[PDB]
Protein backbone atom coordinates (compact mmCIF):
# COMPACT_ATOMS: atom_id res chain seq x y z
CA UNK A 1 0.00 0.00 0.00
CA UNK A 2 2.50 2.69 -1.28
CA UNK A 3 1.82 3.68 -4.91
CA UNK A 4 3.65 5.43 -7.71
CA UNK A 5 1.16 6.34 -10.45
CA UNK A 6 1.65 6.08 -14.24
CA UNK A 7 2.14 9.50 -15.81
CA UNK A 8 0.42 10.66 -19.03
CA UNK A 9 2.68 11.93 -21.88
CA UNK A 10 2.25 14.80 -24.36
CA UNK A 11 0.06 13.40 -27.12
CA UNK A 12 -2.53 11.87 -24.75
CA UNK A 13 -5.77 13.85 -24.73
CA UNK A 14 -6.28 13.74 -20.97
CA UNK A 15 -3.59 16.46 -20.62
CA UNK A 16 -5.68 18.80 -22.89
CA UNK A 17 -8.93 18.67 -20.77
CA UNK A 18 -10.18 21.20 -18.23
CA UNK A 19 -10.08 19.25 -14.92
CA UNK A 20 -13.30 19.30 -12.83
CA UNK A 21 -13.48 21.03 -9.46
CA UNK A 22 -13.17 18.78 -6.38
CA UNK A 23 -16.56 18.62 -4.65
CA UNK A 24 -17.57 19.21 -1.05
CA UNK A 25 -18.14 15.49 -0.57
CA UNK A 26 -14.48 14.81 -1.38
CA UNK A 27 -13.12 17.25 1.25
CA UNK A 28 -11.66 15.53 4.34
CA UNK A 29 -12.24 12.08 2.80
CA UNK A 30 -9.83 9.15 2.84
CA UNK A 31 -10.42 9.15 -0.91
CA UNK A 32 -8.87 12.60 -1.23
CA UNK A 33 -6.04 12.01 1.27
CA UNK A 34 -5.19 8.82 -0.59
CA UNK A 35 -5.31 10.64 -3.99
CA UNK A 36 -3.01 13.26 -2.54
CA UNK A 37 -0.62 10.74 -0.95
CA UNK A 38 -0.32 8.96 -4.32
CA UNK A 39 0.32 12.19 -6.22
CA UNK A 40 2.89 13.11 -3.60
CA UNK A 41 4.64 9.77 -3.73
CA UNK A 42 4.57 10.07 -7.56
CA UNK A 43 6.21 13.48 -7.47
CA UNK A 44 8.99 12.41 -5.03
CA UNK A 45 9.89 9.19 -6.80
CA UNK A 46 10.67 11.13 -9.94
CA UNK A 47 12.31 14.15 -8.14
CA UNK A 48 9.58 16.64 -9.14
CA UNK A 49 8.98 20.02 -7.40
CA UNK A 50 5.31 19.99 -8.25
CA UNK A 51 2.65 17.77 -9.81
CA UNK A 52 -0.93 18.05 -11.04
CA UNK A 53 -3.68 15.42 -10.88
CA UNK A 54 -4.33 15.40 -14.66
CA UNK A 55 -0.77 14.11 -15.20
CA UNK A 56 -1.71 10.87 -13.35
CA UNK A 57 -4.97 10.36 -15.26
CA UNK A 58 -7.05 12.04 -12.50
CA UNK A 59 -9.02 14.87 -14.24
CA UNK A 60 -9.54 16.85 -11.03
CA UNK A 61 -8.42 20.22 -9.74
CA UNK A 62 -5.63 19.20 -7.33
CA UNK A 63 -1.94 20.23 -7.47
CA UNK A 64 1.11 20.06 -5.28
CA UNK A 65 3.70 22.81 -4.95
CA UNK A 66 6.85 21.47 -3.25
CA UNK A 67 9.99 23.46 -4.16
CA UNK A 68 13.31 22.18 -2.80
CA UNK A 69 16.97 22.49 -3.81
CA UNK A 70 18.35 19.64 -5.86
CA UNK A 71 21.00 19.42 -8.64
CA UNK A 72 18.44 20.77 -11.16
CA UNK A 73 17.47 23.84 -9.06
CA UNK A 74 20.25 24.51 -6.52
CA UNK A 75 18.73 27.99 -5.89
CA UNK A 76 15.22 26.49 -5.20
CA UNK A 77 13.81 27.58 -1.82
CA UNK A 78 12.84 25.06 0.89
CA UNK A 79 9.11 25.04 1.60
CA UNK A 80 6.77 22.66 3.30
CA UNK A 81 4.93 20.93 0.44
CA UNK A 82 1.43 22.25 -0.14
CA UNK A 83 -1.48 20.38 -1.61
CA UNK A 84 -3.92 22.79 -3.19
CA UNK A 85 -7.56 21.85 -3.86
CA UNK A 86 -9.44 23.86 -6.50
CA UNK A 87 -6.69 26.49 -6.75
CA UNK A 88 -7.44 29.85 -8.50
CA UNK A 89 -4.75 32.37 -9.35
CA UNK A 90 -6.28 35.68 -8.23
CA UNK A 91 -3.52 37.90 -9.60
CA UNK A 92 -0.41 37.79 -11.74
CA UNK A 93 2.36 40.33 -11.43
CA UNK A 94 2.98 42.22 -14.68
CA UNK A 95 6.63 41.76 -13.60
CA UNK A 96 7.93 38.72 -15.51
CA UNK A 97 10.69 36.18 -14.76
CA UNK A 98 12.39 33.70 -17.13
CA UNK A 99 12.50 30.18 -15.77
CA UNK A 100 13.93 26.78 -16.55
CA UNK A 101 11.07 24.25 -16.65
CA UNK A 102 10.71 20.48 -17.27
CA UNK A 103 7.59 18.31 -16.99
CA UNK A 104 7.11 14.54 -16.49
CA UNK A 105 4.43 14.81 -19.15
CA UNK A 106 6.95 16.25 -21.69
CA UNK A 107 9.88 13.78 -21.57
CA UNK A 108 13.36 14.64 -22.98
CA UNK A 109 12.31 18.23 -23.72
CA UNK A 110 12.88 21.11 -21.26
CA UNK A 111 13.07 24.84 -21.86
CA UNK A 112 12.77 28.52 -20.87
CA UNK A 113 9.34 29.89 -20.02
CA UNK A 114 8.22 33.43 -19.10
CA UNK A 115 6.17 33.46 -15.82
CA UNK A 116 4.75 36.16 -13.58
CA UNK A 117 7.23 36.74 -10.74
CA UNK A 118 4.34 36.91 -8.27
CA UNK A 119 0.98 35.18 -7.95
CA UNK A 120 -1.81 35.57 -5.45
CA UNK A 121 -3.69 32.31 -5.05
CA UNK A 122 -6.88 30.97 -3.45
CA UNK A 123 -7.27 27.27 -2.74
CA UNK A 124 -8.85 24.76 -0.39
CA UNK A 125 -6.70 22.53 1.84
CA UNK A 126 -7.36 18.76 2.03
CA UNK A 127 -9.40 19.39 5.22
CA UNK A 128 -11.42 21.93 3.19
CA UNK A 129 -10.36 25.37 4.59
CA UNK A 130 -10.40 28.46 2.35
CA UNK A 131 -6.79 29.77 2.02
CA UNK A 132 -5.39 32.76 0.12
CA UNK A 133 -1.64 33.24 -0.26
CA UNK A 134 1.01 34.92 -2.37
CA UNK A 135 3.96 33.15 -4.01
CA UNK A 136 7.14 34.70 -5.26
CA UNK A 137 9.76 33.50 -7.76
CA UNK A 138 10.13 29.78 -8.20
CA UNK A 139 7.18 28.59 -6.14
CA UNK A 140 5.10 31.12 -8.12
CA UNK A 141 6.38 29.53 -11.29
CA UNK A 142 5.49 26.04 -9.94
CA UNK A 143 1.90 27.26 -9.15
CA UNK A 144 1.53 28.64 -12.72
CA UNK A 145 2.85 25.38 -14.18
CA UNK A 146 0.46 23.01 -12.37
CA UNK A 147 -2.58 25.32 -12.74
CA UNK A 148 -1.79 25.25 -16.44
CA UNK A 149 -2.18 21.40 -16.38
CA UNK A 150 -5.64 21.92 -14.83
CA UNK A 151 -6.65 24.12 -17.86
CA UNK A 152 -5.26 21.68 -20.41
CA UNK A 153 -1.95 23.51 -21.00
CA UNK A 154 1.57 22.17 -21.25
CA UNK A 155 4.61 24.31 -20.65
CA UNK A 156 5.74 24.04 -24.28
CA UNK A 157 2.60 25.95 -25.43
CA UNK A 158 4.03 29.02 -23.58
CA UNK A 159 7.33 29.13 -25.64
Interface residues with Zn ion (CB under 5 A) are 103
CB closer to Zn ion out of 110 and 120 = 110
**Contacts of 108 by beta carbon, 8 Å cutoff, 6+ apart:** none
The minimum distance between CB 105 and a second copy, in angstroms, equals 13
- Residue of 95, 132, 146, 157 marked catalytic: 146
Pairing state of beta strands 118-124 and 106-116?
A: unpaired
Is residue 31 within the footprint of a second copy (CB under 8 A)? yes
In angstroms, what CA-CA distances link 40 with 33, 48, 51, 74, 90?
10, 9, 8, 21, 25
The Cα–Cα gap between 89 and 139 comes to 13
Q: Which does 31 bind (CB under 5 to 8 A by kind): Zn ion, a second copy, none?
A: a second copy
Tell me, yes or no, if 45 is annotated catalytic. Answer: no
Contacts with a second copy, 86-125, as mask; x by CB under 8 A: --------------------------------x-------
Is residue 17 within the footprint of a second copy (CB under 8 A)? yes
Is residue 52 within the footprint of a second copy (CB under 8 A)? no
Is residue 83 within the footprint of a second copy (CB under 8 A)? no
Using alpha carbons only, what angle is made at residue 153 by residues 143 and 16, rounded to the nearest 5 degrees?
A: 130
Amino acid sequence: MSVVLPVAKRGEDILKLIAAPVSANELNSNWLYQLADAMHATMLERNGVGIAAPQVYISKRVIIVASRPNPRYPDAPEMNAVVMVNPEILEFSSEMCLGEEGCLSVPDERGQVERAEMVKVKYLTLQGEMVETVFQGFPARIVQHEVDHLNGILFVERI
